[PDB]
Each structure stands twice: as structure tokens, then as C-alpha cells.
Amino acid sequence: ADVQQKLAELERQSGGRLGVALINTADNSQILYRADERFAMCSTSAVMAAAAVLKKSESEPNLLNQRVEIKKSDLVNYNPIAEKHVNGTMSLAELSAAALQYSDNVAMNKLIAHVGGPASVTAFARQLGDETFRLDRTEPTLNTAIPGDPRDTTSPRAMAQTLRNLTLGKALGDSQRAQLVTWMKGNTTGAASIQAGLPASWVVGDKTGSGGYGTTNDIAVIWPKDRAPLILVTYFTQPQPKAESRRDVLASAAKIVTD
Ligand SMILES: [Cl-]
């Protein structure tokens, strides 16, 4: 009840709509707040796209080394890594890392395209047992985050359960699971989000997202010092189309549910 009151107070002070799901693998418990509501994922969906490529690689051993041309026509709105590789190629491994660690839009789009498009990423989620996730669009339109729009959404509960499967469970083979975890632990975009609400000694792998309506998201696997791991999803969105980012809200939610 105390955690619920604190999350409600944070949500009210923020002015927006907050979704939280924590899975504590120490005791198989959950802390849930709006955990069955839908939220626009933004690039948090890159975890599913990268996982689909990793799964495909289990039967195509050299898939991660496959070269992908980067052209001016591939550039989207935010291309911090791909813009450095225009007119050359990047491997699928490099694109996975760029999508996951830099939120690179070209990289995300190349993962989506490789596996067959948004409906194929969604079908992979279904194969894993996630019947909530839906990736409808590519970058950049998947970020519109219009209130009431179910496109490109999932729920905190579903994304926490799926992230647990991907990073701690058996969705992926051992090499592929380790690769996903390594990529997420090397993220550069999350230090002000969930990580900012946890002790400095804890180890985090996470994927952020951001988009319209001030949508500010983070999904994480967390290794607290000398404790069983946690999975934490924090999704946040706001009433105003041009609302500013609120990574601090995600940090605050993380602190509340892990205190
Ligand atoms: Cl600390």
C-alpha cells in the first residue's frame, strides 16, 4: 500500500500517466501500477526486434556477420551511429548494438526489415507467449504516442514478463541471451532513467524509449548487489503533444519500487 501511494503521488505530481511492473526473482513477486494499461513503447520495442534477429541467428550461424548497406535514403530522424556509416555497410551485430545502445533509428529499421517487418516482430512476440505487444509501424512514425491509440503499444506487465524471458529465461539460446544482456548492459541512453533511481553499485541492462506526448520509457534487467535479479518496466506519457521528456519520473519510480 505504501508503494502504491508513493507511485500515485509521483504520477500526480508529474501530471501524466505512469505504468510500472517490477518482477523480483528472489520471491517471484510483482509490484504493479497501471500494469495492464497500454503505453506507446517507442524504441523500447528494439529489444523485441533484436531478440527476433538473435533467434533467427540460432539456425543461421553467420547471420550476425551479414552486411547491410547504409544509404542516405535510410536516414531517419535520429541516426547517431548509422550517419557515420553512410555509403558503407554495417553488420547485423553492429546494427543490433546501435539500435539497443544508442536508439539509432536506422539500426532499428534494419532489424525490423530483416525479419520481415513490424508484423513479423509481433509474430515473434506471439511465439514467445506475449499476446499484448504490438509493433505496427517503423521508425519514426512508431513514436507518435497519441493518447488512446493502440498502435505500437504494450502493457508494463507483458513487457516485464517478456523481458524476463529474454534476459533471464530461455527464449534465446545461451550465446544469444548472453549477447542480448551484453548489449543492454552497454546502453548509453539510460543513465538518467531507471539507473538514476538505483544504488550506484547495482548492475543494469536497459533500453529506453521516447516520443510524442512527452513519452519517456525504460525497461531494465537489474542485478542488485548480492541479490536475485529484478526486471523493471517504467512507462510514462503526458497529456500535451509537445510535452518535454521526464526521465526523472522513471528514476523516481525505480527508487520507490526498489527501496
Ligand atoms: Cl549509491
Side-chain angles (χ1 to χ4, degrees):
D2 188 55
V3 173
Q4 292 292 322
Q5 193 147 346
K6 289 176 157 61
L7 288 174
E9 166 183 66
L10 169 61
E11 180 179 63
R12 179 171 173 176
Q13 288 177 338
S14 78
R17 185 171 62 99
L18 177 66
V20 179
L22 176 77
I23 301 168
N24 184 350
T25 72
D27 62 354
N28 200 30
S29 67
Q30 294 175 121
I31 296 178
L32 302 173
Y33 190 89
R34 300 193 190 284
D36 295 307
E37 299 190 20
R38 286 184 173 278
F39 293 81
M41 290 181 286
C42 302
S43 74
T44 66
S45 61
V47 171
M48 195 75 73
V53 171
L54 284 166
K55 176 71 171 176
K56 193 170 177 287
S57 82
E58 292 176 20
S59 56
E60 298 183 37
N62 209 31
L63 183 62
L64 296 180
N65 287 337
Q66 183 176 312
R67 309 302 301 182
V68 179
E69 299 280 358
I70 309 305
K71 306 166 291 298
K72 289 196 167 270
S73 61
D74 291 307
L75 297 171
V76 200
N77 294 351
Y78 185 66
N79 326 291
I81 305 302
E83 71 178 9
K84 304 185 219 176
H85 295 272
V86 171
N87 296 328
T89 66
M90 294 173 67
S91 68
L92 281 171
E94 286 170 333
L95 290 157
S96 296
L100 292 170
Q101 301 176 331
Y102 290 89
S103 302
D104 186 293
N105 288 170
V106 174
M108 175 58 157
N109 277 348
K110 292 303 184 186
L111 300 179
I112 292 171
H114 179 79
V115 301
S120 181
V121 179
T122 299
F124 172 69
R126 295 292 176 278
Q127 178 174 359
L128 297 182
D130 183 330
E131 298 189 350
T132 308
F133 176 99
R134 53 186 284 186
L135 186 64
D136 290 63
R137 289 171 296 170
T138 57
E139 290 285 2
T141 64
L142 65 77
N143 300 291
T144 52
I146 297 162
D149 189 344
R151 293 181 292 176
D152 307 295
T153 64
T154 195
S155 70
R157 185 197 298 265
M159 191 59 112
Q161 291 289 345
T162 297
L163 189 63
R164 181 257 291 283
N165 190 18
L166 292 174
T167 62
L168 302 175
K170 300 160 178 55
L172 298 173
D174 284 2
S175 181
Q176 294 74 29
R177 179 179 66 178
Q179 181 65 84
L180 179 61
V181 166
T182 293
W183 281 333
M184 293 186 69
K185 284 167 61 177
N187 184 32
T188 73
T189 74
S193 300
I194 286 168
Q195 287 170 49
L198 305 176
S201 65
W202 295 16
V203 175
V204 173
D206 80 295
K207 178 77 202 71
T208 58
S210 69
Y213 289 82
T215 297
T216 314
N217 298 331
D218 200 13
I219 70 176
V221 55
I222 300 160
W223 291 268
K225 181 173 159 187
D226 297 317
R227 298 186 174 271
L230 312 173
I231 298 285
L232 178 58
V233 170
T234 58
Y235 276 173
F236 181 67
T237 193
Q238 301 181 68
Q240 305 92 356
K242 300 184 194 166
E244 294 190 89
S245 65
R246 291 295 303 274
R247 294 176 296 270
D248 65 293
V249 169
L250 308 187
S252 293
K255 177 176 182 186
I256 288 163
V257 302
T258 62
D259 267 352

